[PDB]
């Protein structure tokens, strides 16, 4: 029959969960955001569509920090993203409280994973309308992750989601091929600034504001920080240059 797409935890005849698939739509319909894992950290960047001149520049911050060493960025229903970050924050606080040591990125990923997966178990709830790119540095290395509305997630070398995810994924794959030794924190920041500019073509209609953050063992001491001032402008130009 039909109607298999009206309730959240229902398996359609072909074993799919349409409500989760419809959530993915809300994600694709959102701004493009990305993550690039470098040789000792990770970089997060996102496209901020400037609906008008009335939006105070540099204000409506999108990237979020979890604990003191994790960065999170997402595309789709923004409020859903915050909700998930809030949970991640409680999730991380609890872990540190019991184990003393700040939560390992992998451990943290499964925490968000289990939580999101949980919203595909009952029809009393709706799946999360966002894909999240997050990661950081921990006891052993840097880790980059992307989590889907289905609750699925994997470790990435580079990741992208949103409107212009295809452009991004293409650009990321190039970097992966042309740098089997590993990009640097400094480099990834510029590279990221570029990929957002390119991927912004699938939305070339509206003007935007670029946002970047990073977490590098050597550059930020393993602490997630936002790219501001000079380092930011330097990367904004590195892009504006290679976009022509």
């Amino acid at each position: 029959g039909t109607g298999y797409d009206l309730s959240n935890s229902v398996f359609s005849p072909d074993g799919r969960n349409f409500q989760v698939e419809y959530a993915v739509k809300a994600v694709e319909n959102g701004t493009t955001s990305i993550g690039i894992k470098c040789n000792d950290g990770v970089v997060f960047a996102v496209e901020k569509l400037i609906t008008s001149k009335l939006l105070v520049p540099q204000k409506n911050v999108k990237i979020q920090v979890v604990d003191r060493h994790i960065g999170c960025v997402y595309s789709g229903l923004i409020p859903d993203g915050r909700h998930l970050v809030n949970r991640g924050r409680e999730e991380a606080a609890s872990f540190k409280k019991l184990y003393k040591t700040p939560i390992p990125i992998p451990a943290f990923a499964d925490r968000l994973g289990q939580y999101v997966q949980a919203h595909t178990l009952y029809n009393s709830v709706r799946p999360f309308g966002v894909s999240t790119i997050f990661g950081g540095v921990d006891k052993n290395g840097a880790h980059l992750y992307m989590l889907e509305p289905s609750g699925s997630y994997w470790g990435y070398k580079g990741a992208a989601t949103g409107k212009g995810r295809q452009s991004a994924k293409a650009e990321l794959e190039k970097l992966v091929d042309h740098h089997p030794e590993g990009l640097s924190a400094r480099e990834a920041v510029k590279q990221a600034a570029k990929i957002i500019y390119l991927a912004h073509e699938d939305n070339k209609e509206k003007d935007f504001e670029l946002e970047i953050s990073w977490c590098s063992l050597s550059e930020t001491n393993g602490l997630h920080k936002f790219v501001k001032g000079d380092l930011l402008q330097e990367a904004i130009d590195f892009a504006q240059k290679e976009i022509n």
């Binding site: 009206l6 309730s7 029809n123 009393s124």
Partner: protein, 244 residues
Amino acid sequence: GSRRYDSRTTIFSPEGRLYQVEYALESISHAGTAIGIMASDGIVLAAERKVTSTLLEQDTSTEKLYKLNDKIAVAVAGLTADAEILINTARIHAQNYLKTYNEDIPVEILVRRLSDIKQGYTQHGGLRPFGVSFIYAGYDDRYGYQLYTSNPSGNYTGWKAISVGANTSAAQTLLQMDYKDDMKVDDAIELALKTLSKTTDSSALTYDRLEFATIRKGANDGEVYQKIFKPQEIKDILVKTGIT
């Protein structure tokens, strides 16, 4: 959400009827017929075992006559399992009463309580009603011998003779045709068997397809005694009453 699969078992029809109660009654109308006849010196309960086989153990069986108290018994018509649930809580109410007042529970008081429980499933909870109708045969020192009936609605009434289950119309007419106020237990026993014998959907009325019980006040004693006739006892009385 869930609301989608909710049958709403407790709502009124445009005509002001209770769907589930009405359908439960329809269910009961297909159950083996049970009869209750009250005489001057006692009460008779008779019931027809719906469906039987050669291998069905009739000595260890009891699907229609249950003892609630030493002075109260009931005849069941409908879902056996449902009936047992109710019978058990009925047996407990009897004991609570006894422990509180040190007196056996007056017949109506017990019938009303059990009826109220049924009425409940009718106004709240979203659960289906119990597909059961009872005939209560009992005795107390305030009204002596009493015969009551309660159905899924939770309504109950008193009778001199009554039947529940299948072909109640035919049964009721036959009873209202030969019942007399000055009857005697033995007369009633006969009327009961006769009535069942004429309303059965089966070939003949053999003992293996009946359950019998009587609540008499054995003159040689001064107390009330319940007798749940044994297979052989039914076989006997079945011959004497000329049905062989």
